[PDB]
Design a protein around this nucleic acid. Sequence first.
RNA 1: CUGAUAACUUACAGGACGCUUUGGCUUCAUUGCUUUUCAGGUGAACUGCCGAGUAGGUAG
Lengths: 197, 310, 338, 338, 338, 339
Amino acid sequence: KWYYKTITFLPELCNNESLAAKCLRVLHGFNYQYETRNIGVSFPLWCDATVGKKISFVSKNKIELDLLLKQHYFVQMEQLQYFHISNTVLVPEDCTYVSFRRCQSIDKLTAAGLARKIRRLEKRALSRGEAFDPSSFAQKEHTAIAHYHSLGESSKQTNRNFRLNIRMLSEQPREGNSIFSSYGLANSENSFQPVPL
Amino acid sequence: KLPTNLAYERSIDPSDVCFFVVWPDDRKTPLTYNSRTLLGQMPHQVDFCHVPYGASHIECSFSVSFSSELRQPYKCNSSKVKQTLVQLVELYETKIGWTELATRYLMNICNGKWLWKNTRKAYCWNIVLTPWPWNGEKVGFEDIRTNYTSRQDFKNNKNWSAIVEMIKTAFSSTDGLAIFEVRATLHLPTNAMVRPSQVFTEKSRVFQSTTIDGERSPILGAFKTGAAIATIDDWYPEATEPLRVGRFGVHREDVTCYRHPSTGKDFFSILQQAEHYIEVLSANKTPAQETINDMHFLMANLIKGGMFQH
Amino acid sequence: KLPTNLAYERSIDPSDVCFFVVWPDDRKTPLTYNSRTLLGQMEAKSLAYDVSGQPIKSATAEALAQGNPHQVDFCHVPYGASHIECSFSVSFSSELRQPYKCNSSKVKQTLVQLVELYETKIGWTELATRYLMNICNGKWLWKNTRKAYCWNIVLTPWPWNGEKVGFEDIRTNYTSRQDFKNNKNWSAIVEMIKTAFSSTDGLAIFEVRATLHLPTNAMVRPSQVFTEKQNSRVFQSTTIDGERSPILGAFKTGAAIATIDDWYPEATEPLRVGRFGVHREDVTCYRHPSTGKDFFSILQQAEHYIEVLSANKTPAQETINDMHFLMANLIKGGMFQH
Amino acid sequence: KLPTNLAYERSIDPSDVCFFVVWPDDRKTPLTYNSRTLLGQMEAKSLAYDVSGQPIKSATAEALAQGNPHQVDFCHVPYGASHIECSFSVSFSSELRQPYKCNSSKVKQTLVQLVELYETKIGWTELATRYLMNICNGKWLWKNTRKAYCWNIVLTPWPWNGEKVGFEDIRTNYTSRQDFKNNKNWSAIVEMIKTAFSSTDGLAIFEVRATLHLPTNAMVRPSQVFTEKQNSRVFQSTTIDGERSPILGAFKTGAAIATIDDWYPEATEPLRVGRFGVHREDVTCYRHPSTGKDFFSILQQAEHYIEVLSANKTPAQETINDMHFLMANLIKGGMFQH
Amino acid sequence: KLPTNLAYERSIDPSDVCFFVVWPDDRKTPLTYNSRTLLGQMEAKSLAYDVSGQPIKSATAEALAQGNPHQVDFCHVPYGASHIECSFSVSFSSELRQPYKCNSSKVKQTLVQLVELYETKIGWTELATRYLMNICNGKWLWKNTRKAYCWNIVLTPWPWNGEKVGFEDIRTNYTSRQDFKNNKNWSAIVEMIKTAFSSTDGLAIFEVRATLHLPTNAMVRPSQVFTEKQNSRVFQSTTIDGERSPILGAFKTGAAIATIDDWYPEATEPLRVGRFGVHREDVTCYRHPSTGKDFFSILQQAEHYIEVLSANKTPAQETINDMHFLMANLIKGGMFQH
Amino acid sequence: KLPTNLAYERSIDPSDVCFFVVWPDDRKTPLTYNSRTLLGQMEAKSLAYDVSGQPIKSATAEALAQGNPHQVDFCHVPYGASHIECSFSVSFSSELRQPYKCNSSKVKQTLVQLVELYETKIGWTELATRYLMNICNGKWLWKNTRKAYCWNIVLTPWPWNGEKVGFEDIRTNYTSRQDFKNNKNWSAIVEMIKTAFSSTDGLAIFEVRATLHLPTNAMVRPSQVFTEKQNSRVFQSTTIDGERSPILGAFKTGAAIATIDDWYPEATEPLRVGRFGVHREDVTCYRHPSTGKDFFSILQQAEHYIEVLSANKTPAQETINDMHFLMANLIKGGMFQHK
RNA sequence: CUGAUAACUUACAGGACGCUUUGGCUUCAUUGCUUUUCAGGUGAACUGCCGAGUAGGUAG
């Protein structure tokens, strides 16, 4: 038994990634005063490109979901007609169960990232033997990927502009209650807990 | 004038700039890149070329050869403007020697101008060029940010007397020749961006590559690294920056062309006055504002020559 | 004269000059070219000049700043290559004695007598030494000799009973005629062209192999296809071991070892032996039929030229120089029938 | 005489010559040709001379410089090939003993009796030798034999019981009849061309295989097509393994092995055994009916030639040299009915 | 006699020949011909002989040597073929019993009596064997059997309970009549021509295929189309799998198996059974109406032959030889109207 | 009798027999012929005989050998084809009861009464059996059945509630009349024709399809045009798929199924049912008015034939045989005017 | 507002029989396609930790 309060980015000229980034940034900023790992992310009309002009917030107990939209961020946005919000509607049991997992192995393929991986492998060569020759590696020739459709998150403790990127896999229409994470999530290392779209 | 079949042949003949990675054990492997295409769930290929981890330095090897193919045109059609052009070049040869163009061509070889962007955020880079015909030792230019900046920094004792001359003989002596084999060592930082030449693809970022030791390597063009050592033209109405020696002194990154056919300082109005320019070189002395600065451009455009038909 | 059906068969049959790349392992691969597209700038004369004024404002500073792209075939020496090996074969036969078709046995008998008189009076030594100074100095490479360190020519004649004939670095050593006229290499292979021109059923086949030392990644210039009218600068190519490779032509390298004609009114530089002494660079032609030193103006005076070869001595200003040219045109051509 | 319906059927039935490039790997490939475009000079006599003086200035010194482009077919040996292999079959039959149609059964007797009297008196040795010498000396290659190192000919006769009769390198070895007429080879296969012509329902089928060693990517010269009336020099071709390959004629390799006629007014060269004795090179035909030595001037006095082949002996000047020409035109025969 | 409406229907109905090229893969593709233009020389008797002198000097030694083009269809075995497969079907019927039209019940019962009396007295063995000897010796191939290594014939009759009848190489094995009498083949295929001629509504449908082993790319000779009036040899063709193929006639293959007529004044060779015994080679027709041994002068004595076929014993030279001709003429019969 | 105007319509309506060549893939193309020119000998009796002596001195031994050309249409099965399918439709109707035009209501009532008495007294079995026996044994192909391995005839009758009527290999199996009377469908298609003759406005359509196994590229014989006044032997053709095809005629394959008449004075062979019994093999017509057995010597006696058909009993040799022949002529006939 | 005002052409059909177009053939000499060329990532998707790990995970 789940509920959702949708937010629609209204004014018809908006880099939806830049909006969805800060919306998930304040969901990440949410649940740090209270260690609660309950709520999903639910991108409803995720297209081939340009993530859709609204976002649903399918949730757990619903004492959290309403509380999630009482953060004085969405309030301070609301005085200008930017967002339009719904009244916590029941999920119908006839719905698609898509998993919105942040892959994070996309940035194991960038040379800046592969430099990190080799440098790690070189530091933990203290598992003794022959200290491996760092000339025995090749960025393949055609490292081909789909689809990953990235956002624009930034770190808060440090001034590092990290970027998390979400995929759209679908299976097994019921799993756990919930387990999730700080960044909403459908990924957290144990459960592939899908989202009712 | 412009007699319907007039063609000169280039004197500066550059090659491809083959990139190489030197490891700390003194063994040189060709620099290899990777090409990612995005297969959006139901073509657009982007290439990435960074310096691999634990690399000592980067070698950039190419060969430029100065020849004497500016004395006589390749096709003339009419032997009336022929002797005019042969007289014009040998008058320029005698009156105001080949020192200026030679030095200007040899500065942007011996300072790494042909690397274009790979010198940016680099600690130090050293250029060694082997000339021919030569009799002794390799001419080496050490760290070219601190030591060599201006002309006078290049005009030191044991290097510059004997390699600017041998370009002057290679332009004057009919069936004359000079072959410089240039080799630059970039000391780029840990996993820096290398910017090679990008191929056309009529409509993003797929490079020009050749196969060295069975595997592909980015190449930095042939007509790009020739258009780099001929970024010489700065005798255009006033002066801001050295341009590529075209006919209409065309700028690339900004999409305008200085030396318009309207301003009367482009290679077609300056050419057709040649018979006048033979006059002012006959007796002393040439005013070095409209004469020397135009004869420099005229000769600099003859070295890029072919074709001036109709 | 010119009896409506006179033809001659050519007396020098060259071949295509196959390029090979030899590596420091003493192994050979075919030299392979690629077709690349490049971005030129609008530097054509008639893109900002009508005839020969200034245009409407369609040649504005925006219009002449757009790069016009060409697609050309780029062939260069691969990195780590030792040197380039160019190989062809030439055949000297005696198919200038008797015309292929004659039609009338009064001009035929004239021309067989004229060849026999030229042979016996002023022999084939001049034309032989001239035709062999183009095979042995690498004129058939055309452009690849400009900006080359050293090129050595090794040629294998037939019939022969000994070693190979090899001319080493040909920029310093073999410059003049006397430099070629040395010990083991000229008295014996100028003879066997003279015995292959003077004798019936005469033959001399040379297999020529030139080694080019070009600089690092140096540009190699083969011949081009005609393409009777984007892709300009398309190379003539043939298949070696499955791989396509550029070829430098068969007819181009026949017009390399037949650029001996410096007997045209005054003198500048040797032309290719044509009827109307056509120069390709200067697009005018020396020996225009007005001057009366083209082929047909000299041929029709054959019965005159026989009477000058009656007794001593042949004048070396306007008879030897003209009969050289006449015989040089009988060696090449066919047909001159009208 | 010549009774309005009189045709003969030919005795010698040759075929196409398939060219096969053979490599050092002991594999064979069909020799392929390519349509190559090229740039010749303005070298035609009619361009710069009208009739028979000088052209008015539309044909200036610059108009004779622009090279006219031709499109020809180029066929050469590929680089790294061992030799060229030329295969054809020839079949000698007994189709000269009786005319195909006769119309009058009094002139059938004359021509039948004439062939019987020629057989019994002056036998088939001369014609059979002159036919087979052309088969075994490589006349049927025409021009590929010239500018070649060495060429071997191996032919398998039928019916036969022994080794294939190998004629090795034919330049130094076999030049004259006595070099051909030696021990192991020749006397056994000149009979079976006699016993083909002499006996009723007689037949001999030779399959001739020649190997040409030409120089490095030398030019192969096959037969060209007519095209009844740009592209000059179109090669006649057949398809081997769905790949087009040049052919060197069928009626061209019959014209080759029947170049016998040196029994004509003077005597210079073997002509192709025709009626009016057409020499293709020197266009004027020997055995013109004004001479009275052509086929119809010889046949219409056959009743004279039946008198001479009884009494001992016959003169080898104006009897045997005419009877040879007679049988040479009955072997090619068809049709001479007026 | 000859009652103004007398016609017979034919008894032997052959079909068109189909040439297939069998490859070493044992796959069969149809034989295809091409049309090639070729250069002959002026060989016609009426180009240098009016009647019977030498003509106006437009046909001199110059104009008699100008080569004239013809155009011909060339059909040959392709290079790398195993053998040619020639397939057709022949049908023996009993339509020689009653006339198709008779008009009068006086000649009808006469002719029906004459067939029954011939059938009874001297049976079909002679004719049946003669018709079957040149279905099985490949006479129907006409010209291709000459200049061929060996040809095998396999035929499948109907009705039949057994294995296909096979005559292997018909050059050495099968020459004479007796040689066709092998123990296990011949005696039971003569029968089903004797009991398909004799019995009412009788039948025999032979399907015959011959394999031809020819030399290297040798010419195959099919049948040529008439063209009532430059083009000699326009071959008769049909479409197999969308490809045109040369056919060798429908009536020609019937005029080959019916060459059995050697019962004429003397006897040289078998003629095609006609009313006036026409020989197409020697254009004079033997068995002329003047002799009184033609069909129309033998038929009109029919009432004579019915008397002779009722008493002992029929003289095997005048009566039997004429009864053979009568019945062999009724077998292809049609039509004796006047 | 013969009242100057008296016409009957047709009761058997056949069609054109469309030839189709069918391949091993079971795709059917139309059959195609070609006009090929050929060279024949001088075989005519006219060219070497006056009457009945010897020719002028222009028919000499050389003049009797210069072969003369003709131009003949040639149709054959193409190479590699499986077999030939021949398709047409017969339509039996009840247009033999009353004359189409009659002019005088005295002979009309006579002929209607005569048909009714022949219907009730004698069966339609005899005529219908003789009619059906040569729609189902391939008489309608004439000469294509001769020199052919086997032919199979499948017919789709109408009106019909069931399957298709099939006749397999017709050379051994279906030879005699009893072989047709065998098991299943025969007893219902000799019926429904008698319904098509007995019932007023009765109708029976039979669509026939024959398969022919001819030898390899065998000769096919269609019907030829007339050409009244050069191409001798021009084939009758029609358009299928926009290409021409040989046809075998409408009236030829009506003259095949209507070969009943073997009651003519004695008997040798069944003829075409004409008035004067015209034979084509021999060009003398049997059953002509000097015998008094033609259609006009039998019809004028029609009234007499009624007086025998009422009482017992008709002798099956003269009276019944002529009543069969009358009705065989009534089915085909039109028009018995004069004039 | 028509050379106006009205108008049933019907019935029946067997083109068939026979055929040899063929003989001979030389397309071939000559050939230079050439000259000059910038495709363009402002900085920008980072640093760990677990893994024996060019396997895969994950925080910020």
